[PDB]
Chains A and B, each alone.
Chain A
Amino acid sequence: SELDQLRQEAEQLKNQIRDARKACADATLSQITNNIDPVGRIQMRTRRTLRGHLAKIYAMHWGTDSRLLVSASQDGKLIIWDSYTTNKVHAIPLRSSWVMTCAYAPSGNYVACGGLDNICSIYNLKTREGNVRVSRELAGHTGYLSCCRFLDDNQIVTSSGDTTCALWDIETGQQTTTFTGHTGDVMSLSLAPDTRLFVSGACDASAKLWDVREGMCRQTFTGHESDINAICFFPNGNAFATGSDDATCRLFDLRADQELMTYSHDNIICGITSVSFSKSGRLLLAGYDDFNCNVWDALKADRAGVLAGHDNRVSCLGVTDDGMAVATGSWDSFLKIWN
């Protein structure tokens, strides 16, 4: 009776949402963008290969200086590279071999990583004794760390396979806020430019927009037919894109509260591991389990180019803040810098 009367209310609500969304869908982005020039053929080339990892690379994150980047690997290490010269700044061997993710703090003073240990682990990069050491192990997740991002030196958001995300106070080592709502493994998060909101993508095939300060889901985006493996804010923070096992990426606008476009191709059958926009937002670069990364005109949905260098999954990618360079990490064990 009560499980019925609420589930009957659940649809009438779900309807109101579909219908309000439909009320706004007066035109399509591809109709709106129809008149502007194409970007033409984007042919980027490998300008660096980064060697040192002895096994698959899982994650990478550029520093805000657009010069150094961290990479996380199956070989149990993090490596911080000087992309301009190819030199290693640091090689950090980890306590748990099972890292899946890594983050560089905006300051440059810190990096974070973790995985099947279920512990986001913070590393201090400029000690009083000039060494690289663990300043904090953040326990509390009951599932694997899938992704994490700093707001500042003392705050970080984590996504977990326990299906929760969380915001931490690093000094006290406690979850300030827990973000419950996903019903399957969360796999990525991305912070909005102003660190006020963030989005997460899960194995429930939905993305959720969270209010960081309050601790709640404001909007929930569907459309995908399979796990969302990656997520990313468009540079002005009014939209984001997703990467899925269903072989598509999608653009989602916050204030329209719905999908605006799909990026796909009959010839592309495999899943997307990673996503990022160019600086202006015009290009959406996505990494694939077919060894390539595809470069999409985010406004027209056309395919603009391809980065074809790796010999195994492209497993992660980032664009630099100055927009000069794309980094790709691969299961082949190398990173590559493109432009």
Chain B
Amino acid sequence: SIAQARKLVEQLKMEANIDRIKVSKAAADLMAYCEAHAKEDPLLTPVPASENPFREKKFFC
């Protein structure tokens, strides 16, 4: 209890003592990541159906 309320305060001190970036910068870095990897994502950028296991691919290992 008095142990476990000093444990909280010590932990909160850890959480306060980080430093942070603007949400504007954060959002931009995510948006930039998606655009960099848009062509690699088959759910956005479909690949040819003969290379898709679940469409038309016949040969496998």
Contacts and interface: CB of A to CB of B under 8 A. Distances in A.
A298 to B, nearest CB: 8
A33 B26 CA distance: 12
B34 A281 contact: yes
Interface in A243-260: 253, 255-258, 260
B35 to A, nearest CB: 8
A235 interface: yes
Contacts of B12: 10, 13-14, 17
A281 B6 CA distance: 39
B24 A32 contact: yes
A123 to B, nearest CB: 24
Contacts of B54: 47-48, 83-84, 324-325, 337, 339
Interface in B1-59: 1-2, 5-6, 8-9, 11-16, 18, 20-31, 33-35, 37-38, 40-44, 47, 52-55
Interface residues of A, number: 64
B34 A323 contact: no
A280 B14 contact: no
B23 A256 contact: yes
Given A282-B41, A339-B42, A27 B27 contact: yes
Nearest to A15: B16
A238 interface: yes
Given A17-B12, A32-B28, A299-B31, A278 B44 contact: yes
A284 to B, nearest CB: 11
Contacts of A283: 41, 43-44
Contacts of A325: 53-54
Interface of B: 1-2, 5-6, 8-9, 11-16, 18, 20-31, 33-35, 37-38, 40-44, 47, 52-55, 60
Interface of A: 2-3, 6-7, 9-10, 13-14, 16-17, 20-21, 23-29, 31-33, 36, 39, 42, 44, 47-48, 67, 83-84, 181, 216-220, 234-236, 238-239, 253, 255-258, 260, 278-283, 298-299, 319, 322-326, 337, 339
Closest 9 CB pairs of A and B: A47-B54, A280-B41, A32-B27, A29-B27, A280-B37, A13-B12, A256-B26, A253-B26, A27-B24
Given A260-B23, A323-B43, 5 more contacts: A217-B15, A235-B37, A236-B33, A239-B30, A255-B21
